[PDB]
């Protein structure tokens, strides 16, 4: 599997190896704010990241992942649309070549400069690989990034990116506090969907925050200096690693707020 984001291996090609690419609950989607309905039954959202244990940062050739110790209930997501307890395993971003594109979800067709995905798995399935085979196995918290003021809590991430420029490079990344990536408000939209990269599994409860975070142009520029390629290969900048919006089909996006 040689999937990527190029003309020859990008999202329009994925369905040949991963036919669920054309499925009934694919992500991302456009969030039409006028059509999403407030749902009073949504319980409050609980982001419990006080005991988060970050380990490592990895350039996987598609994005960079900040990996956590998920061997116990340290950093968990509960409440909102979720039943039970979801453990943080990793976060990563999707971003653009330019500030006008980069996010995977859109808001009334508006593209943000980037999108953060905090990935969590349902602890009733015991491990991540079992959780991704279940329709309620993952909860992904999605956070939009706009270019404006710098986000201080992001700077430790951007400062390490020089050490993982190319595919397969990793660096120790302990003691990173993902609380510093959150906006003030936890108002969100939620809908059932999928992973946005191969294998595109339909196992995700999406929770997308309404409030974007602001990052500086300097911060996002540093994202765009990463490489898709491995060391000693021709340089292909890691930009535009986003899948476009997919058909909503028979789904409703619910809002937690009026």
Ligand X SMILES: O=C(O)/C=C/c1cccc(OCc2cccc(CC(=O)O)c2)c1
Nearest-angstrom CA–CA distance, 211 and 189: 11
Residue 92 annotated as part of some ligand binding site: yes
The alpha carbon of residue 215 and the mean position of all alpha carbons in its chain are separated, in whole angstroms, by 16
What residues contact 115, with CB distance under 8 A and at least 6 apart? 93, 94, 95, 102, 103, 104, 105, 142, 143, 144, 145, 242
Site residues (vs Zn ion, CB under 5 A): 117
Which of 47, 119, 182, 220 is in the footprint of ligand X by CB under 6 A? 119
φ/ψ of 190, rounded to 5, equals -140, 145
**Which of the choices ligand X, Zn ion, none does residue 195 contact, using the CB cut-off of 5 to 8 A by kind?**
ligand X
Smallest separation, CB 241 to Zn ion (Å): 9
Smallest separation, CB 163 to Zn ion (Å): 22
Smallest separation, CB 165 to ligand X (Å): 19
Residue 34 annotated as part of some ligand binding site: no
**Which of the choices ligand X, Zn ion, none does residue 132 contact, using the CB cut-off of 5 to 8 A by kind?**
ligand X
Place of tokens 């956070």: 143
Nearest-angstrom CA–CA distance, 17 and 1: 8
8 is annotated as an active-site residue: no
Number of residues counted as binding ligand X (CB under 6 A): 9
Nearest-angstrom CA–CA distance, 174 and 150: 22
Asked if the bond preceding 222 is cis, omega within 30° of 0, the reply is no
| Nearest residue to Zn ion on Cβ basis | 117
Closer Cβ to ligand X, 118 or 161, answer by number: 118
Residue 166 annotated as part of some ligand binding site: no
Under the rule (CB under 6 A), what is the footprint of ligand X? 117, 119, 129, 132-133, 195-197, 199
Summarize the annotated binding site for Zn(2+) as residue ranges. Answer: 92, 94, 117
Active site residues: 62
């Amino acid at each position: 599997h040689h999937w990527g984001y190029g003309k020859h291996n990008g999202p329009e090609h994925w369905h040949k190896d991963f036919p669920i690419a054309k499925g009934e609950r694919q992500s991302p989607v456009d969030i039409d704010t006028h059509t999403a309905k407030y749902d009073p039954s949504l319980k409050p959202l609980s982001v419990s990241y006080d005991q988060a244990t970050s380990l490592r940062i990895l350039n996987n050739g598609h994005a960079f992942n900040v990996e956590f110790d998920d061997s116990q209930d340290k950093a968990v997501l509960k409440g909102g649309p979720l039943d039970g307890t979801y453990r943080l395993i990793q976060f990563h971003f999707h971003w653009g070549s330019l500030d006008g594109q980069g996010s995977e979800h859109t808001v009334d067709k508006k593209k943000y400069a980037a999108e953060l995905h905090l990935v969590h798995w349902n602890t009733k399935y015991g491990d991540f690989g079992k959780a991704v085979q279940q329709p309620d196995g993952l909860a992904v918290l999605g956070i939009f990034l706009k270019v404006g003021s710098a986000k201080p809590g992001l700077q430790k991430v951007v400062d390490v990116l020089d050490s993982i420029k190319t595919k397969g490079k990793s660096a120790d990344f302990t003691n990173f506090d993902p609380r510093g990536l959150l906006p003030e408000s936890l108002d969100y939209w939620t809908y059932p969907g999928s992973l946005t990269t191969p294998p595109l599994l339909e196992c995700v409860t999406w929770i997308v925050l309404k409030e974007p975070i602001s990052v500086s142009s300097e911060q996002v520029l540093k994202f765009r200096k990463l490489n898709f390629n491995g060391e000693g290969e021709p340089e292909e900048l890691m930009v535009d690693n986003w899948r476009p919006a997919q058909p909503l089909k028979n789904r409703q996006i619910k809002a937690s707020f009026k």
